[PDB]
């Protein structure tokens, strides 16, 4: 539920910000974002990106926080 | 439009052709 | 550790925070007509 | 211990009744009943015992004070089981729609061009425009609500969540001024606003023991551990 | 001597209920002799599980009360007296007999088990002494549960 | 034993679903899947994929669960 | 076969040529 909220909100934020390529869709973008949460991602490709400096920062915010607090927080719960 | 040389792409760039946005300054640099 | 401590607290933490949520709403709810006797049903023996 | 003593320090002797906080009188062979005065709920203009308990933070001995009963524990259940729980969900649901709208306009915003001119013609130009106005209007309420919080108590982490709400609403306002200014860069600010609001939304779950624990833990990671490591 | 409370709280409570609640042989004795109904069910919210209200359930009938509060002598006097012997197999509103109520009153603490356990014993010894034909432990509460099966349904180990 | 069961079942499910490329073999597909369990993978390539929308979902199911419950569950056991 | 425009590739696509399956709708979009 929590990851879904964080992921969903972040995906919505991305969808508005730059359609770019493969981020045009919410179903695809969410898949793109989930891949990031799992910890497999390709980072700062940028190319064809608007507010990329703005955007790279957004990716740093979302990816870092998600790996850092949700996954560890769930994982901490798991032991 | 295209943010020619010294053009800042925080948003709306769309950096011109010979230019490329480098994700620190957000200005457009080429060459 | 923060997760563990939060877990040990969280029956309690969950309790205190709620009260704060209730209080703020009560203050901002226009102080509209609302309750304003307490007793607790009890049964322990002790007998 | 003393707080509990002062509220519940029931007295029985001639002249006892005027002094006492709690009277309990209902026992069956098993069974017992306790009655509480209760003054703390009564205190208002002064911060009061109840008010202090509601407000008090970062002391670190709090778990105990909140726990205090019958009234503090008893009073809350009476306040909320009867009506409060219903009120909060309506607030949460109302907030959620505001979020769907803020994202929807942002999701479907027209590239243009920057800001105006906007045609505002037909359903396509009509639905989005309503959303944009609605989202800004949604933004004002947070700003107005926040100012009172700053205004009611100017002096001085906690409260962590209210503080975030003010930041996001302001961010939207910055975007709106930009939109009137009409600079393209204004989006980026809005984009922060859309995501921040969504992250904020997760707060409403609070007051739920499973859920309340998670939000608290997240707040803890960010005030302390993340902040320290960063 | 048999008038009862009618408010939702103490509903059906009689003077005899109170005498027992107060652990007062003398007043139990007196009330029974002036004809207190020994089968009167105190069934108001004060005699069921806490809202919390609370509290507290034993259910209902004087015998059940007298046992659940660990008051052997009065259990005996209820069942053995000249004036009205208690019906040892009566069921409360929920179908519970004194054996059911005892199971309900257990809370898995060592001294709890100990007292319930032997008051239970005591009831059976009295059943077999006074009314030998009665298979007490076979009697089902509303939900179809023997005392044993209730015990196990509610983790009263 | 448990990972082998989960991995084996998932591999069998994949082998039927779309032979595609490099998923045609069970020995290779298992290797492809084990790589995913180790946490090194390339995600949502899709290309030449049937039921990819169906398939991406399957990958999300298997990869997420495997990283999420088996690895952590074994790792939780390890401390 | 090939799922022309507006053709859904949940299974059996096999999206035509100019079309490409985008993994949300599962329909085939081109251009």
């Amino acid at each position: 539920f929590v990851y879904l909220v964080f992921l969903f909100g972040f995906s919505t934020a991305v969808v508005t910000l730059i359609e770019d390529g493969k981020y045009n869709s919410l179903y695809s973008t969410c898949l793109e974002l989930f891949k990031f949460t799992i910890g497999m991602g390709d980072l700062e490709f940028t190319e064809n990106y608007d507010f990329k400096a703005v955007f790279i920062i957004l990716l740093l915010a979302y990816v870092i926080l998600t790996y850092i607090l949700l996954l560890n927080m769930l994982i901490a719960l798991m032991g | 439009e295209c943010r020619k040389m010294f053009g800042g792409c925080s948003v709306d760039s769309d950096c011109c052709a010979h230019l490329g946005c480098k994700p620190t300054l957000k200005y457009c640099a080429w060459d | 550790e923060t997760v563990n401590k939060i877990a040990q607290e969280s029956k309690n933490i969950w309790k205190l925070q709620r009260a704060i949520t209730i209080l703020d709403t009560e203050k901002s709810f226009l102080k509209c007509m609302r309750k304003a006797x307490x007793x607790x049903x009890x049964x322990x023996x002790x007998x | 211990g003393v707080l509990a003593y002062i509220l519940q320090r029931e007295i029985h002797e001639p002249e006892c009744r005027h002094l006492s906080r709690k009277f309990t009188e209902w026992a069956y062979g098993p069974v017992h009943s306790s009655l509480y005065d209760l003054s703390c709920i009564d205190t208002c203009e002064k911060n009061s015992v109840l008010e202090v308990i509601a407000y008090s933070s970062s002391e670190t001995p709090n778990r105990h004070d909140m726990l205090l009963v019958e009234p503090l524990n008893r009073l809350l259940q009476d306040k909320w089981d009867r009506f409060v729980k219903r009120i909060f969900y309506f607030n949460f649901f109302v907030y959620c729609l505001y979020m769907i709208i803020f994202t929807a306009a942002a999701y479907y915003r027209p590239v243009e061009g920057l800001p105006p001119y906007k045609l505002k013609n037909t359903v396509g130009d009509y639905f989005r425009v309503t959303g944009e106005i609605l989202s800004v209007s949604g933004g004002v309420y947070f700003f107005f609500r926040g100012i009172q919080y700053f205004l009611q108590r100017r002096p001085s982490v906690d409260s962590y969540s209210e503080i975030l709400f003010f930041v996001q609403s302001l961010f939207m306002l910055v975007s709106v001024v930009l939109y009137f200014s009409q600079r393209k860069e204004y989006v980026a600010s809005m984009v922060f606003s859309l995501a921040m609001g969504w992250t904020n939304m997760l707060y409403y779950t609070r007051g739920f023991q499973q859920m309340g624990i998670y939000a608290v833990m997240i707040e803890k990671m960010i005030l302390r551990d993340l902040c320290r490591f960063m | 001597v048999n008038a009862s409370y009618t408010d939702s709280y103490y509903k059906g409570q009689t003077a005899l209920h109170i005498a027992i609640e107060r652990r007062n042989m003398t007043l139990v004795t007196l009330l029974v002799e002036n004809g207190a109904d020994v089968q009167a069910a105190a069934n108001g919210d004060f005699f069921k599980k806490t809202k919390g209200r609370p509290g507290f359930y034993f259910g209902e009938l004087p015998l059940s009360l007298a046992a659940c509060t660990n008051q052997l002598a009065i259990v005996k006097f209820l069942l053995q007296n000249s004036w009205q012997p208690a019906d040892i197999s009566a069921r409360d509103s929920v179908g519970n007999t004194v054996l059911h109520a005892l199971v309900e009153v257990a809370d898995n603490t060592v001294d709890n088990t100990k007292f319930v356990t032997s008051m239970y014993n005591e009831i059976l010894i009295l059943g077999a002494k006074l009314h030998p034909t009665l298979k007490l432990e076979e009697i089902t509460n509303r939900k179809g549960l023997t005392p044993l099966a209730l015990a196990a349904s509610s983790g009263k180990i």
Side-chain angles (χ1 to χ4, degrees), chain A residues 1-19 21-51 53-79, chain B residues 2 7-9 15-17 20-21 23 28-29, chain C residues 1-14 16 18-19 22 27-28 30 36-47, chain D residues 1-8 12-14 16 18 20-21 23 26-27 29-30 33 35-40 44 47 53-58 61-62 67-68 71 75 77 79-80 83-84 87-96 98-102 104-110 113 115-116 119 121 124 126-129 131 136 138-139 141-142 144 146 149-150 152-153 155-157 159-172 174-175 179-181 183 186-188 191-199 201-204 206-209 211-230, chain E:
Chain A
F1 271 119
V2 178
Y3 180 20
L4 176 34
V5 78
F6 264 85
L7 109 66
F8 165 108
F10 269 68
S11 83
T12 79
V14 177
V15 175
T16 88
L17 242 206
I18 25 44
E19 141 275 41
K22 157 272 314 314
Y23 275 102
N24 319 325
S25 161
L26 196 33
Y27 183 26
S28 93
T29 328
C30 151
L31 245 270
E32 224 301 330
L33 274 195
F34 184 65
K35 269 175 47 229
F36 268 66
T37 164
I38 293 197
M40 39 197 54
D42 255 15
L43 236 31
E44 236 35 27
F45 275 14
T46 338
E47 24 93 335
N48 87 104
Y49 289 120
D50 215 357
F51 330 96
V54 171
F55 178 63
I56 49 279
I57 296 104
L58 238 207
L59 264 202
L60 272 33
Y62 176 97
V63 173
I64 80 78
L65 149 41
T66 202
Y67 214 76
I68 304 320
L69 265 296
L70 271 272
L71 237 332
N72 326 311
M73 164 180 250
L74 108 68
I75 295 198
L77 318 145
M78 301 245 225
Chain B
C2 161
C9 335
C15 202
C16 307
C21 205
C28 252
Chain C
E1 329 183 334
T2 83
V3 175
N4 302 193
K5 85 127 120 224
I6 154 200
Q8 167 236 5
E9 287 151 43
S10 90
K11 271 133 72 308
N12 308 9
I13 33 79
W14 169 98
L16 89 78
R18 191 207 281 283
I22 298 188
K27 216 68 295 97
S28 164
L30 269 329
Chain D
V2 185
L3 190 171
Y5 164 109
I6 291 165
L7 283 155
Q8 289 35 110
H12 34 258
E13 217 249 353
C16 96
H18 58 316
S20 233
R21 213 127 240 316
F23 333 143
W26 244 55
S33 155
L35 252 40
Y36 299 89
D37 215 17
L38 84 306
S39 165
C40 6
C44 174
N47 244 26
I53 208 325
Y55 205 38
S56 342
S57 253
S58 22
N62 73 50
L67 170 282
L68 203 30
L75 198 186
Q77 218 51 312
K79 302 208 140 112
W80 205 52
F83 54 177
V84 204
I87 201 195
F88 176 56
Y89 295 93
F90 212 142
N91 251 322
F92 171 17
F93 279 105
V94 175
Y95 176 77
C96 325
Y98 200 31
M99 322 311 338
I100 331 105
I101 290 50
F102 191 142
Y107 164 109
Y108 268 142
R109 123 278 229 220
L119 296 174
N121 290 337
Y126 180 20
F127 251 13
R128 72 120 117 117
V129 195
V136 204
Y141 164 32
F142 300 109
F144 203 42
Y149 170 81
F150 214 42
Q152 172 60 167
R153 307 117 186 316
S156 282
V157 174
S159 89
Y160 170 36
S161 23
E162 317 165 25
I163 174 279
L164 273 118
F165 272 161
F166 128 54
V167 202
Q168 167 233 341
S169 11
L170 83 322
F171 258 63
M172 192 179 157
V174 174
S175 161
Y179 192 33
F180 301 162
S181 50
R183 260 223 242 190
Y186 80 96
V187 75
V191 171
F192 297 162
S193 164
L194 212 192
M196 164 144 334
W198 258 136
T199 85
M201 195 239 204
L202 87 130
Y203 141 56
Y204 268 127
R206 230 193 270 238
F208 303 44
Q209 39 289 71
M211 325 333 263
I213 296 142
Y214 300 43
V216 175
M217 93 176 32
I218 197 196
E219 256 87 28
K220 178 84 220 297
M221 327 249 101
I222 329 196
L223 292 324
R224 340 299 259 310
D225 216 347
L226 177 287
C227 162
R228 282 91 120 44
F229 210 77
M230 174 26 93
Chain E
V1 91
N2 284 324
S4 45
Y5 274 86
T6 55
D7 67 315
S8 70
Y9 199 53
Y10 293 120
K11 185 189 172 199
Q13 180 174 58
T14 62
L16 186 55
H17 289 108
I18 303 180
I20 309 179
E21 280 156 83
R22 296 290 181 275
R23 328 186 77 80
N24 200 329
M25 184 55 243
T26 307
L27 292 205
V28 153
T29 330
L30 188 73
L31 269 19
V32 154
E33 291 204 13
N34 305 284
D37 179 25
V38 138
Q39 295 305 131
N43 64 57
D45 294 322
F46 175 67
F47 310 106
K48 307 181 324 148
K49 252 206 267 172
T50 194
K51 260 151 45 26
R53 231 284 131 46
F56 137 92
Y57 161 85
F58 52 80
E60 316 219 345
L61 307 148
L63 210 195
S64 289
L65 182 55
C68 287
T69 69
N70 193 2
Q71 296 192 81
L72 216 189
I74 309 193
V75 168
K76 281 183 181 152
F77 178 83
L78 282 163
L79 290 163
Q80 305 194 354
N81 74 80
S82 332
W83 305 86
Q84 187 172 358
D87 172 344
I88 200 174
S89 67
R91 270 146 39 99
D92 77 6
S93 87
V94 139
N96 286 344
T97 60
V98 212
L99 301 184
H100 292 308
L102 274 169
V103 175
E104 209 81 40
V105 108
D107 70 12
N108 303 297
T109 66
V110 163
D111 298 314
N112 163 254
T113 280
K114 189 184 176 211
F115 115 76
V116 174
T117 247
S118 74
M119 175 65 41
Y120 195 91
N121 184 59
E122 223 60 51
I123 287 296
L124 288 180
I125 291 162
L126 267 33
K129 198 177 74 175
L130 265 21
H131 314 281
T133 38
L134 284 319
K135 282 183 155 166
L136 252 30
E137 286 176 281
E138 302 185 337
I139 307 170
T140 67
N141 74 8
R142 168 139 49 125
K143 248 210 274 71
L145 305 173
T146 66
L148 175 89
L150 210 211
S153 65
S154 56
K156 307 278 158 89
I157 274 113

